[PDB]
């Protein structure tokens, strides 16, 4: 029968969703109070959502807040919401995207699906309502963070690298996306294609970050080379490389704006200057955190006090960057932790993911 075959197709879709454009919906809260996005402002997390950079003195805590779980496999990307830490997003490798309240809440705020491969990278827009997830299927999908529906999708000829949003408020739909075949594309969501293409970088891109807002963006390729290029410009006049590092899988900018952390493949965290003298200090490096060939998140805490790095065995390393020495090491859980971000709301909390499918809040 037709309705019987519809019920059989519903049972088959239930089996496919248990196996893990069709998206899931997380929790029954949806829009809270009079109606707002779940990734905009939860108005329930600790401290101040509209706080400044340095909340207090940064200290390394040894605790666990949320185990989260939800993801069947290890999430390749773990990011936060815009401005405040009222929401955390995990790009689960079973073609899933989850958003949670990032304050110890076990229920996920939002869910999204529709991809065919593992979601490699996740990023958010300047407003915080659009989330662009780039997977291994040579396509990046921009979806709504409050409904999970895919607003747009942009394909590429090569495999998709880490796609980031521009730091300029005037260019919010212009996403910088890397490619496997030695390309960096500043692609507009309104245009639908690559507005600007840069083939000067050699190899597949690894991480694209903003060293300065609307002046120069730093892209790190598969080789140990970081190139700072302007948006929609043909020539790049700033590059950093050395014959000791093997690769640059992670390049991030500190919240203070005084230095940039590059987790090189030679078990070092190179501190590069965030000014026009973009030089990496050989003395100011972190050899106590090992990064051999695995991508991580070499991030910074408030007021340039601590630097957080990840390892493939699951042990996170926190270093006093003011003292330039490894202060603490957290060895919780039996899963591999790569991404780690200190909370902008409270200075005693961090957010990380695991390879067992659990997101850990400390």
């Amino acid at each position: 029968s037709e309705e019987e075959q519809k019920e059989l197709d519903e049972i088959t879709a239930k089996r496919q969703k248990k196996g893990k454009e069709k998206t899931i919906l997380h929790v029954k809260e949806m829009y809270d109070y009079q109606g707002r996005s779940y990734l905009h402002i939860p108005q329930d997390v600790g401290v101040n959502l509209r706080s400044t950079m340095p909340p207090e003195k940064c200290y390394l805590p040894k605790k666990q807040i949320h185990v989260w779980s939800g993801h069947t496999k290890g999430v390749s990307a773990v990011r936060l919401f815009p401005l405040s830490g009222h929401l955390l997003l995990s790009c689960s490798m079973d073609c899933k995207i989850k958003l949670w309240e990032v304050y110890g809440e076990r229920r996920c705020l939002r869910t999204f699906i529709g991809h065919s491969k593992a979601v490699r990278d996740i990023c958010f827009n300047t407003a915080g309502t659009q989330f662009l997830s780039a997977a291994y299927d040579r396509y990046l999908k921009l979806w709504d963070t409050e409904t999970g529906q895919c607003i747009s999708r942009f394909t590429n000829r090569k495999v998709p690298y880490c796609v980031k949003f521009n730091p300029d408020e005037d260019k919010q739909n212009l996403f910088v996306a890397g490619m496997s075949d030695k390309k960096i594309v500043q692609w507009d969501i309104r245009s639908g294609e690559i507005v600007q293409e840069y083939d000067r970088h050699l190899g597949a891109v690894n991480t694209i970050v903003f060293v300065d807002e609307n002046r120069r963006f730093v892209s790190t390729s598969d080789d140990k080379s970081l190139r700072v290029w302007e948006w929609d410009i043909p020539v790049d006049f700033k590059y950093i490389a050395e014959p000791s590092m093997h690769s640059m899988p992670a390049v991030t900018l500190s919240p203070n704006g005084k230095w940039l952390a590059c987790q090189s493949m030679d078990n070092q965290i190179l501190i590069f200057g965030a000014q026009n003298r973009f030089r990496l200090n050989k003395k100011k490096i972190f050899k106590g955190h090992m990064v051999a060939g695995y991508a991580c998140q070499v991030d910074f805490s408030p007021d340039m006090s601590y630097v957080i790095s990840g390892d493939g065995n699951g042990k996170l390393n926190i270093w006093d960057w003011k003292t330039t020495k490894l202060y603490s090491r957290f060895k919780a859980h039996d899963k591999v932790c790569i991404g780690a971000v200190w909370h902008p709301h409270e200075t005693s909390k961090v957010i990380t993911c695991g390879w067992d499918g659990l997101i850990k809040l400390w």
């Binding site: 493939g312 065995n313 699951g314 039996d334 899963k335 591999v336 390879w355």
Partner: peptide
Amino acid sequence: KAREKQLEEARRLAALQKRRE
């Protein structure tokens, strides 16, 4: 003896690495 114990320790380290991964 000691080399076998070091190989067993390296195999245990690889076992915890595979369990983490």
